[PDB]
């Protein structure tokens, strides 16, 4: 399916928009894409169902009362077929969105300014140097909460740049590409937002059971507070 989809995509891209012959070919291209992703779904779910039916002979180990959140969830995904199959449907839908994101990653590099709110920062610096009259009141502080706390707008260019960035961050998260969303946040000078995107990680301390080598502690021990925020 993917070989033929790639061929049909090359054909559709080479043609000027508006010939009725290529609307049918574009419909068939979409239907073959739907066939390809349906085979991927069938492979994922039936592989799990068959494997699960072979493993039901083993008594699942109960989590110790001092188990990390990561260990509790790892045991849930082993025991619970509904949670595991629902996550395979998520992973499948994230894979489709990833196939659509394509080379559009490269176009954002042309618009990612090296500094957060560069235009608002410029306008604030210029106001500090020249008492010239009647420009729209803008935020006085450059923390992400300043627009909300002060109820003052950003520069219109910085507001447009943030709306674009947030739409793309949502597309990367919808594609399961959370690490690339965090890298993009760091590249755009929004390292604070990259840190907010890390707070979902389940708490794990590999050292609780006295291993021979010290391993790094992972995740947020206050994940519930972060989730409420």
């Amino acid at each position: 399916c993917n070989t033929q989809i790639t061929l049909l995509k090359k054909i559709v891209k080479r043609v000027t928009p508006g010939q009725q012959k290529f609307s049918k070919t574009a419909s068939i291209l979409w239907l073959l894409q739907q066939e390809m992703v349906t085979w991927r779904l069938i492979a994922a779910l039936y592989r799990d169902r068959i494997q699960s039916a072979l493993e039901e002979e083993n008594m699942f180990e109960i989590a110790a009362p001092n188990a990390s959140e990561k260990t509790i969830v790892d045991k849930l995904f082993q025991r619970d077929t509904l949670v595991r199959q629902s996550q395979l449907v998520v992973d499948w839908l994230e894979s489709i969105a990833k196939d659509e994101v394509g080379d559009f990653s490269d176009n954002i590099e042309y618009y990612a300014k090296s500094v957060y709110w560069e235009n608002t920062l410029h306008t604030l610096k210029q106001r500090s140097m020249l008492s010239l009259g009647s420009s729209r009141p803008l935020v006085s502080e450059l923390d992400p909460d300043a627009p909300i706390r002060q109820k003052l707008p950003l520069d219109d260019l910085d507001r447009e740049d943030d709306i674009r960035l947030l739409k793309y961050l949502f597309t990367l998260i919808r594609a399961g590409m959370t690490d690339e969303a965090q890298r993009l946040c760091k590249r755009c000078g929004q390292a604070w937002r990259a840190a907010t995107l890390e707070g979902w990680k389940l708490y794990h301390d590999a050292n609780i059971n006295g291993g021979t080598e010290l391993q790094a502690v992972e995740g947020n021990p206050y994940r519930c507070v972060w989730k409420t925020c």
């Binding site: 923390d143 909460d145 300043a146 909300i148 706390r149 390292a191 840190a195 907010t196 502690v217």
Partner: protein, 269 residues
């Protein structure tokens, strides 16, 4: 330093020296946080809603990161609140703040930032003294008593595996004159001398040899160095303005003898 810890009694096995040192470091960290509590509540009450950054700094210098985060959030400083929420247990975050400070200095953007705010970033980066592009020295320890200064060295300047003796040695270098920088920490004076504005006029090295240290610093030295001089530790002048008040010195000697310290001369006994 020496008492029974409930956390060390909960284990049926002889606790490894590393675990003992970690639980002792936590007990000492709790002691430091409690000693600063009355003064931090006074300072935070004085700063009001307008000086929320100074009140946030005051909570950070007492190890109350959660209350610093809540205060920053209530004041509308959501960026500072987010930053503070990430400080518990990440060395990578400290290194990123250090890089951010270096980049602000290289770009000469640091001179537009409030000094109190730069002081919070300096504390979070684990840098005790920062030189701004304007040649202004931002000293994190300049408004701190010796106890909070030592606490900042234990919590922010050292790794979470560092011993009490490493924190004490780093603090001792902070108030000693060295070829590499000006002293940035206060000298550990007894509390009856803490409010004496001893104007350290232009010759400090000959005056520190005459200035008595707080008894708590002498105990921290004795804990770090088993052969530390007991004559200075048991001097009434380390505790009280009255040189005839032997109350604490005598009871400390009985406890130190119970701990098997025996190196006090018979004449001094």
């Amino acid at each position: 330093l020496w008492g029974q810890l409930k956390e060390l009694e909960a284990s049926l096995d002889e606790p490894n020296e590393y675990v003992r040192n970690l639980e002792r470091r936590k007990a000492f960290s709790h002691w430091l946080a409690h000693t600063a509590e009355e003064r931090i509540e006074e300072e935070v009450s004085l700063y009001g809603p307008e000086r929320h950054v100074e009140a946030v700094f005051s909570f950070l210098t007492g190890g109350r990161i959660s209350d610093a985060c809540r205060l920053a959030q209530k004041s509308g400083d959501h960026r500072l609140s987010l930053l503070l929420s990430q400080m518990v247990g990440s060395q990578e975050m400290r290194e990123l703040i250090s890089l951010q400070l270096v980049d602000w200095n290289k770009l000469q953007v640091d001179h537009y930032i409030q000094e109190e705010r730069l002081r919070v970033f300096c504390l979070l980066s684990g840098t005790p003294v920062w030189r701004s592009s304007d040649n202004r020295s931002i000293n994190v320890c300049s408004q701190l008593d010796w106890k909070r200064t030592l606490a900042v060295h234990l919590w922010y300047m050292l790794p979470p595996t560092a011993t009490i003796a490493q924190a004490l040695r780093l603090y001792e270098r902070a108030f000693q004159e060295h070829e590499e920088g000006e002293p940035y920490a206060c000298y550990p004076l007894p509390p009856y001398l803490e409010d004496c504005s001893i104007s350290l006029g232009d010759e400090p090295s000959a005056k520190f040899s005459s200035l008595q240290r707080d008894v708590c610093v002498h105990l921290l030295k004795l804990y770090s160095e088993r052969q530390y001089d007991l004559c200075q530790l048991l001097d009434p002048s380390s505790v009280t303005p009255d040189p005839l008040d032997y109350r604490l010195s005598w009871h400390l000697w009985m406890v130190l003898q119970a701990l098997n310290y025996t190196h006090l001369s018979e004449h001094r006994q």
